[PDB]
Design a binder for this molecule. Structure first.
Ligand code: HEM
Length: 184
């Protein structure tokens, strides 16, 4: 179960964040740690497509090779805080699992600049019991977290030392698919 009402960044710049480009997860913290594998990789694209606010997600377990993409149109709750009903798709946007009520995530941008971000998400997927997930993002998949984003982690009353890095997993991303999926 999720327990946090994450606070969005003061002054969040939506057009910069949702610019159509890719964000890579470099580090994550699940407050129910035993909810997600210790070795993982994930990335997303975020942008407006034909007037609609969109995200495209990619998940890859580097040990099991379990792979999936998602696309969602984000609904606005407040600036920097969204609710996203997702559909599982292949890399070309063909639907594998349609949108349905009860399959959604919340998404809060706690901090962002041009290169880095800190987000919170709470996933709801049917009857699974999932907890709060924080992720440090960067535009560069290999970037070490800098002081702006690590300070933001502190300001959220979190300890960056507890985050798990995704960097040592050889993950390789299909950026082209993530960008194109924004339209799907
Ligand atoms: C930007 C950040 C992330 C968002 C918005 C996000 C969103 C989601 C969504 C929507 C699903 C369900 C997909 C579907 O069934 O179609 C999912 C599943 C999953 N995510 Fe994430 N995720 C993110 C980061 C991560 C990270 C960093 C991990 C780390 C370990 C992770 C682990 C998982 C796992 C293991 C599942 C499969 C749940 C299951 O069905 O059993 N996610 N995520």
């Amino acid at each position: 179960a999720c327990t946090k009402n994450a606070i969005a960044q003061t002054g969040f710049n939506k057009d910069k964040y949702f610019n159509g480009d890719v964000w890579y997860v470099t580090d994550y913290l699940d407050l129910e740690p035993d909810d997600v594998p210790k070795r993982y990789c994930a990335a997303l694209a975020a942008g407006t497509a034909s007037g609609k606010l969109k995200e495209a997600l990619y998940h890859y377990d580097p040990k099991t090779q379990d792979t999936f993409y998602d696309v969602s149109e984000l609904q606005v709750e407040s600036l920097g805080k969204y609710t996203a009903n997702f559909k599982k798709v292949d890399k070309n946007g063909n639907v594998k699992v349609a949108v349905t009520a009860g399959n959604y995530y919340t998404f809060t941008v706690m901090y962002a600049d041009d290169s880095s971000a800190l987000i919170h998400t709470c996933l709801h997927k049917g009857n699974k019991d999932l907890g709060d997930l924080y992720a440090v993002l960067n535009r560069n998949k290999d970037a070490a977290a800098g002081d702006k984003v690590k300070s933001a982690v502190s300001a959220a009353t979190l300890e960056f030392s507890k985050f798990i890095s995704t960097k040592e997993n050889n993950c390789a991303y299909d950026n082209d698919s993530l960008k194109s999926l924004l339209t799907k």
